[PDB]
Amino acid sequence: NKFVRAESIVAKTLATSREKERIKRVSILEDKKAKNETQHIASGKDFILKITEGLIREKTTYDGKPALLFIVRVRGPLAVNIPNKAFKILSLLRLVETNTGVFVKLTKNVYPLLKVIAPYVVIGKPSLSSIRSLIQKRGRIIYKAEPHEIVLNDNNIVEEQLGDHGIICVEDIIHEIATMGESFSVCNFFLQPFKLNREVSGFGSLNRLRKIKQREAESRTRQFSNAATAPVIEVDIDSL
Amino acid sequence: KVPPTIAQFQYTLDRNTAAETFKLFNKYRPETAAEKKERLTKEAAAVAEGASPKPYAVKYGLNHVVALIENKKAKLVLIANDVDPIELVVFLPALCKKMGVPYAIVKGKARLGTLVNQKTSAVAALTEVRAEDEAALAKLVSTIDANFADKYDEVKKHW
Amino acid sequence: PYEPLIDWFTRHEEVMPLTAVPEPKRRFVPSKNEAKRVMKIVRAIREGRIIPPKKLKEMKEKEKIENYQYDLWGNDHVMHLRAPKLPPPTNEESYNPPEEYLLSPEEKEAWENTEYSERERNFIPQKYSALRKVPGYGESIRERFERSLDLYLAPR
Amino acid sequence: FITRSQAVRKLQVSLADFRRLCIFKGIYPFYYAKDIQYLMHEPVLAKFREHKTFARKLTRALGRGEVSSAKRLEENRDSYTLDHIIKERYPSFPDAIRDIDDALNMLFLFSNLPSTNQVSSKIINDAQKICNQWLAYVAKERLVRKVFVSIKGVYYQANIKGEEVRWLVPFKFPENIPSDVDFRIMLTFLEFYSTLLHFVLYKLYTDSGLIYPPKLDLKKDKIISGLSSYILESR
RNA sequence: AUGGUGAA
RNA sequence: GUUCUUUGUAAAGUGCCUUCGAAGAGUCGAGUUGUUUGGGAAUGCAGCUCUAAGUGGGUGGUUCCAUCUAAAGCUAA
RNA sequence: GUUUGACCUCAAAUCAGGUAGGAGUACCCGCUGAACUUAUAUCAAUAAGCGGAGGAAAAGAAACCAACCGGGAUUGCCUUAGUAACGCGAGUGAAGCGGCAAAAGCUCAAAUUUGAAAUCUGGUACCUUCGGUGCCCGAGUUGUAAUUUGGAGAGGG
C-alpha cells in the first residue's frame, strides 16, 4: 500500500494517548460517583450544556426523569482512532458508520456512556415534527436468508414484522419512539437506524469553499472540553 | 555542461523540509488588497464616530530582499529556481553566504508568489517573527542549514 | 578548463554590514501612508461618498428579500409554434377500485413482462382492504422524469 | 434546421448550459436557425458566461491558497433571475395558471423527496415552503373540488379562477430514488417552476388581499408542522 | 550621368 | 473683484549640531579595413579580432598644474 | 494524487478600446549619390532617388572654450577673416575671444516605504464630462507610489 510517514503515526499516537487518558479519568470518576464516594471529586451533580444560535450557552442539571435523545455520528477527532472502550459502546449502538443516527432513552446508567462518546457524536432532543419527518423520509426493513435491506414501503409490512404490540403502521412506530412507550426499546432496535446524508455531499470549486466554511463553523459550534466533569453538549437537532 | 555557479540551483530542499517551510510561511501571508482595504475602511468608520503592534509579514521584493540582505536583518531567504533572467539571482546565494544569512533554493517562482498573493515572486525572506514561532524559526533555520550546506556542500563545485 | 569555484572571498563571513544608513523614524513609527488613506476615507464618508461597511450590511439585509413583489401581468398563436399538450386524466388507478379493474394474474404477468414506455398502463390496480394499508409509490419519480424529458424533447 | 452540435457551436456554450437555456425558453427540435439565433440574445447566456469566469477565478484562488479571496468572491456573486423569462413565455396570467399543473406536480414531488447528494436540502425546504403556501391559499379559498386516491397518489383539482387545474401529490412514505432518472435535468425544471409558483402565489395573495410571504406558526411547527402551521394574515 | 517609358 | 471650500498631528523653505552619503561596459580605448574635410594629431562617421578602473576617466598646456564628469532623456525664444 | 490547480510559453475571436500606410514637400532630419564643367585636387557630402514630422525642424543646458584679473545652454548676424590651416602651385578654407537678438532650466538610473504597491490601464453606476467619485477586474513585487541628479543628496535634534 501507500507509504506511511512518521508525522501521521506520531500525531495519531499522541491523540490516541490523550483520548485514552481522558476516557480512563472519566470512567474512574464516574465509577467513584456511582459508589457514592463523592467526598473528594471536582463535581458530583451531572450537567448538560445546550448550545444554540449570537451563540448562547445554557448549563442545566440532569434529572432522573426519562427523556428522548437523538444521536448522530460526527467522525471526530480527526487523528483519534476509536479506542476499545468507545468501540464497544459504538458497536452496541451500531453507529460505526458516519452520519448514522439512532434514538435512545436517556437514563442515569446511559449518562456515563453519553459522556464517553460525547466528542464522537452530537446529541440533542428533537421535536415531534422533526422525529416524524425523519421517520417518514427514511427507513429500512430487513426482508427475507434475509440479505435485503429494502426501504420501508408498506404498512402491511409493519403488521407482518411486529404485529403483536399493535404496531400496524409507521405512525404507530412514530408515536412509540416520540412517546415513552413500552415498545420504545423493541421498535428502535428493529428500526434499522437511519443513514442521514452528509452535509456538503459535493466536491468542486464552490463545493470545496462550502465544505471549508462548514468545517470552520463546526469548530466554533462544537468543542471537546476533555474535562473529567465535562457536561454533555446539546445542539438544536431540529435544524438538521 | 554549465559553470559551477550555474547548476547550483535545482538542488532544492527535500519534500519534508520544503513542506515545513511553506507551512511556516503560510502563517505570515501579507494582507491582500481586499483585506487591507476593508481594514482601512473599518478604521475610518471608527474614526468617523470615534496602538497596534508592528505588523508581521514576509518580505519578498527582489530589491527589497537584497536591501535586507547585506544588513544582516534578514534571517531566512527563499530563492526561486526558475527565474528566466538568471543573472538576477545568480549572485544571491553567494551574497547570502558571504553575509552569513541562511538561505535556501525552492522549486518554482509561482510557489513563492502564491504565499505572497503574487503571480510570481523571485524571492521570499523573513525579517522578524512572532515570539511563538521564534523557536520554530530557529529549528527551520537549523534544518535548512543541515540539509543544504552540509548535504549539498559540493553544490558550488563540479560544474 | 573545468575547475571548482573557490571561496577566497566567501570563506570569511561578513561580521559588519556594508552601509550604516541610520534607520528612519518611520520604521519605528506606525505607517503614515496608512494614516493618510484612513483620513481620506474618513473625509469621503463625511462627504456622503463612501457608505460605511456596517451601513452597507444594514441596507443589504433589508434588500435581497424584496423579490417576487411585483405583478408580472397586471403566445403560441404563431403558425410555427404549438402549445405543450397536458397529460390526460386518470385511467382508473383507484386504491379501492371495483373488482373488475383488478387485472387477472395471467394478464398481470403479461403487463409485467411487456417492455417499458410502450405499455397501456404504468400501474396495476389493486383492491386494498383499508386506506391505511395503501403503500407508497416509488415510480412517481420516473414518471415525472419522463414527463420532463418529453416537455423539452417534443418535435412539435 | 441546424444540428444540435451546430446550434451549440453557434452559441459556444456548454451542453448542460445549452440544455438549461433550451428548457427555460421552451425550445424544441435539429433546431430552427432563427430560434437559436434569437436565443443568443438572452441575458441568461451572459450570466452563464459570468458564472464560468467566476468558477475559474475561484478555482485559481483556492489553488493558490487564499481562502479569504475565494470567500470574498463568492459573497459578492449574485445568481441570475428568471423573472423576465417568465413574462415572455407566459404573457398573460391565465396562461401561467393553465401551465401551473406541471409546476405544482414537480414541486409537490420534490417536497417529499428526501435530501440527497444530487439535490441540497435547501431546495427541498424551499419546495416544501412553496407547497405549504399553495395549500394554505387553496384551503382559505376552498377551491378543492375533486379528490381521487390512487396508487400514484391523491389527484387534487383546485379551481383557481375556474381553471380547475389538476395536480397530483405522492404519499408520505419513503421513496427509493432510482438511478435512471437524471436529477440535473429535473433541477432546471424545479428552479423554473419554483420561480413561477413564487410569482403566481404573490399575484394570488395580492388579488385576495393577503400579505405575502406569510410567516409560519412556530408552536405548530414543532408539533404538526405542515399546512396547518403556515398561518396567513389578510393584512 | 540621374529618374522613368516601349519594344521582331 | 465676487465668493463656495478649506483638514491633516498634511506639505514646503532657511541657519545651526550629529550620522550617513550611492553617478550610465561589447562602453572608452587600442588594432585593422573603407568614407569625410582644403582640416598638418583622417579628429568625425562605417565593418570587425580584442576590450579596463573607480581618491577613476576624458580634454590640454608643462615637471606639475587648468577644466569637465561621456557611454540616458525633455525644453518656448 | 494514474490527480487538480498554478507559473511560463504559443495560437484563435467579423470580441472591446486604439494607431501606420497616402498626399503635399520651399525649409529641416538621416541613407544614397554621378557627369558636363577646371588645372588625388574640382564640379561635389551638388543634381536625381529613398525614409521621417512640423510651422518651423535639428541642437540645446559641457567628459565645453581657454592658459587669461579666466568666460559658463543651444541658436542666427557682424567681426575674428579671406587670417590660421590644407594644397603648398591652381585654389579650398574654418573656430576661441569681442559686439548684437533672445535667455528657463530641468527629467531618469543609481543607496529598503517595508509600521502596511501607498501606483496605474480597462469595465460598470452616477455627476458639476478635454474629466471626477464608488465598486469590480487586471498590469505590477523580474518594481508602479515620496525625495535627488554633485549646483550634490539623505536619516535625526
CB-CB contact of A85 with A22 (8 Å): no
A133 to D225: CB separation less than 8 angstroms, yes or no: yes
Rg (Cα) of chain B, in Å, rounded? 18
D66 to B34: CB separation less than 8 angstroms, yes or no: no
> What Å resolution does this PDB entry report?
3.5
Q: Which residues contact D21 (CB under 8 A, 6 or more apart)?
A: D11, D13, D27, D39, D42, D44, D45, D48
| CB-side neighbour CA atoms (13 Å) of D92 | 5
Q: What is the dihedral of CA B30, B32, B34, B38, to 10 degrees?
A: 10
DSSP calls for C73-134? -----STT--PPPPPP---S-BSS--GGGS--HHHHHHHHHSPSSS-S-SS-----S-GGG-
Read off the DSSP letter of residue B146: I
C145 to D181: CB separation less than 8 angstroms, yes or no: yes
3 state DSSP class of D130: helix
Question: From CA D152, how far away is CA D154, in angstroms rounded?
Answer: 7
Structure determined by: cryo-EM
D189-224 burial, b at 16+ Cβ within 10 Å, e below that, comes to: bbbbbbbbbbbbbbbbbeeeebebbbebeeebbeee
Domain boundaries, chain B: 1-159
Strand F nucleotides, any atom under 7 Å from protein beta carbons: they are: 7-11, 19-21
Nearest to A106 by CA among A94, A114, A96: A114
My answer on whether omega of the bond before A77 falls inside 30° of 0, hence cis, is yes
3 state DSSP class of B91: helix
Question: From CA A163, how far away is CA A217, in angstroms rounded?
Answer: 45
Q: What is the dihedral of CA D117, D121, D127, D128, to 10 degrees?
A: 130
Give me C26's grid cell: 518611520
Q: Residue D167: enclosing H or E segment and its boundaries?
A: strand D165-169
Residues of D with Cβ-Cβ distance to C130 under 8 angstroms = none
Distance of CA B152 to the CA centre of its chain: 19
Q: Nearest C-alpha of chain B: how many angstroms from D13?
A: 29
Nearest to D87 by CA among C148, C71, C152, C69: C71
My answer on whether omega of the bond before D91 falls inside 30° of 0, hence cis, is no
Nearest to B106 by CA among B70, B147, B139, B68: B147
Give me B36's grid cell: 487591507
Distance of CA C132 to the CA centre of its chain: 38
Q: Nearest C-alpha of chain B: how many angstroms from C155?
A: 51
Beta-strand relationship, A47-52 and A67-73: unpaired
CB-CB contact of A121 with A72 (8 Å): yes
Q: Position of cell 443513514? A: A195
- Beta partners for A50? A58, A234
Domain B1-159 has CATH 3.40.190.10: no
Domain boundaries, chain A: 2-240
Q: Which nucleotide is nearest to B114 if distance is taken from CA to C1'?
A: G6
C4 to B158: CB separation less than 8 angstroms, yes or no: yes
Return the residue in C63, C65, C73 with the most chain D beta carbons within 10 A, the one to mutate for interface testing.
C73
Q: Which nucleotide is nearest to C51 if distance is taken from CA to C1'?
A: G134
Q: Which residue of D has its CA nearest to C76?
A: D89
Question: From CA B123, how far away is CA A9, in angstroms rounded?
Answer: 34
Which spans in chain D are helix H?
A: 4-11, 15-25, 33-39, 43-64, 67-76, 83-89, 93-111, 121-141, 183-207, 218-221
| CA A184 / C1′ G94 distance in Å | 125
CB-CB contact of D142 with D154 (8 Å): no
CB-CB contact of A127 with A69 (8 Å): no
Q: Which nucleotide is nearest to B62 if distance is taken from CA to C1'?
A: G141
User: What is the greatest pairwise CA distance in chain B?
Assistant: 68
- Beta partners for A234? A50, A123
Rg (Cα) of chain A, in Å, rounded? 20
Question: From CA A237, how far away is CA B155, in angstroms rounded?
Answer: 62
Return the residue in D89, D150, D164, D184 with the most chain C beta carbons within 10 A, the one to mutate for interface testing.
D150
Residue D51 — φ and ψ, nearest 5°?
Answer: -65, -40
User: What is the greatest pairwise CA distance in chain C?
Assistant: 110
∠ Cα C79 C84 C86 (to 5°)? 140
Question: From CA C11, how far away is CA C31, in angstroms rounded?
Answer: 40
- Beta partners for D146? D157
Question: From CA A108, how far away is CA D111, in angstroms rounded?
Answer: 40
CA D38 vs CA A70, B125, D33, D45: distances in Å: 55, 57, 9, 12
- Beta partners for A61? A47
Q: Residue C145: enclosing H or E segment and its boundaries?
A: helix C140-152
Nearest to D55 by CA among B110, A209, A202, B111: A209
Q: DSSP E strands: which ranges in A5-95?
A: 47-52, 56-61, 67-73
Residues of B with Cβ-Cβ distance to C47 under 8 angstroms = none
Footprint of strand F on the protein (CB under 7 A): C 19-22, 32, 35-36, 39, 42-43
Q: Which residue of C has its CA nearest to D87?
A: C72
B29-53 burial, b at 16+ Cβ within 10 Å, e below that, comes to: bbebebbeeeebbebbbeeeeeeee
Question: From CA B147, how far away is CA B141, in angstroms rounded?
Answer: 10
C135 to A153: CB separation less than 8 angstroms, yes or no: yes
Residue D190 — φ and ψ, nearest 5°?
Answer: -60, -45
Look up residue D135 and give its amino acid. L
Q: Nearest C-alpha of chain D: how many angstroms from B155?
A: 31
Q: DSSP E strands: which ranges in chain A?
A: 47-52, 56-61, 67-73, 101-106, 121-124, 232-235
Nearest to C136 by CA among D78, A154, D108: A154
Rg (Cα) of chain C, in Å, rounded? 40
Q: Which residue of C has its CA nearest to B46?
A: C42
Inter-chain CB pairs, A–C, below 8 Å = 14
Positions 27-86 in B, CB within 7 angstroms of strand G: 30-31, 33-34, 36-37, 41, 52-55, 59-64, 67-68, 71, 73, 80, 82-85
Give me C147's grid cell: 414527463
- Laid out side by side, the sheet with D144-149 consists of D144-149, D154-158, D165-169
CB-CB contact of D185 with D211 (8 Å): no
CB D76 under 7 Å to nucleic chain G? yes
B26, B35, B114 ranked by CB distance to D68: nearest: B35
Q: Which residues contact A114 (CB under 8 A, 6 or more apart)?
A: A69, A71, A106, A123, A232
Nearest to A149 by CA among A197, A191, A210: A191
Question: From CA A25, how far away is CA A116, in angstroms rounded?
Answer: 10
Look up residue B25 and give its amino acid. F
Question: From CA B124, how far away is CA B64, in angstroms rounded?
Answer: 10
B32 to D69: CB separation less than 8 angstroms, yes or no: yes
CB-CB contact of D154 with D147 (8 Å): yes
CB-CB contact of A92 with A202 (8 Å): no
B121-143 burial, b at 16+ Cβ within 10 Å, e below that, comes to: bbbbbbbebeeebeeebeebbeb
Residues of C with Cβ-Cβ distance to A168 under 8 angstroms = 132
D149 to C131: CB separation less than 8 angstroms, yes or no: yes
| CA B64 / C1′ G107 distance in Å | 25
CB count in 10 Å sphere of residue B103: 24
CB-CB contact of A55 with A220 (8 Å): yes
Question: From CA D193, how far away is CA C151, in angstroms rounded?
Answer: 13
Q: Which residues contact D37 (CB under 8 A, 6 or more apart)?
A: D10
